[PDB]
């Protein structure tokens, strides 16, 4: 347990370095791949973003997530603005930002997927 504590303290500072508005880590999942829906072609594309997923909250307690990319300096930090914008479909978390902007997340471990989904919904529960 103690090695994980230090690891989360280090991860949070890596996060704050790229994204100083991040206040804390809610939860984590390893080996997440990111896809984008090209509706100008009706095709999913796999992005170059794969790495550790961090569900985080703002200093204003807005909920979002970061994927620290294991391939490049280009990470991804997105907000989850409305809980109904996130759907568990098949093996994927589908995240729709209003006006037809859709990303999809694949978590290596199926248990991370349904756990993170619940934590996302409960984090926004009001």
């Amino acid at each position: 347990e103690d090695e994980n504590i230090l690891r989360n303290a280090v991860n949070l500072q890596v996060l704050k370095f790229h994204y100083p508005e991040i206040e804390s880590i809610i939860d984590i999942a390893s080996h997440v791949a990111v896809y984008q829906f090209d509706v100008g072609s009706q095709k999913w594309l796999k992005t170059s973003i794969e790495g550790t997923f961090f569900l985080v909250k703002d200093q204003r307690a807005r909920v979002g997530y970061v994927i620290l990319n294991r391939n490049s300096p280009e990470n991804l930090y997105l907000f989850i603005n409305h809980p109904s914008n996130v759907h568990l479909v098949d093996r994927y978390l589908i995240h729709r930002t209003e006006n037809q902007h859709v990303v999809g997340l694949w978590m290596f471990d199926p248990n991370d997927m349904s756990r993170i989904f619940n934590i996302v919904k409960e984090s926004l529960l009001r």
């Binding site: 791949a33 509706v39 796999k46 479909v89 694949w106 290596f108």
Partner: peptide
Amino acid sequence: AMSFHSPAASNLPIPTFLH
């Protein structure tokens, strides 16, 4: 309102937007 080593992008379900 919609409806419908890492996997190939072709495996993801297709979102459909309604009007």
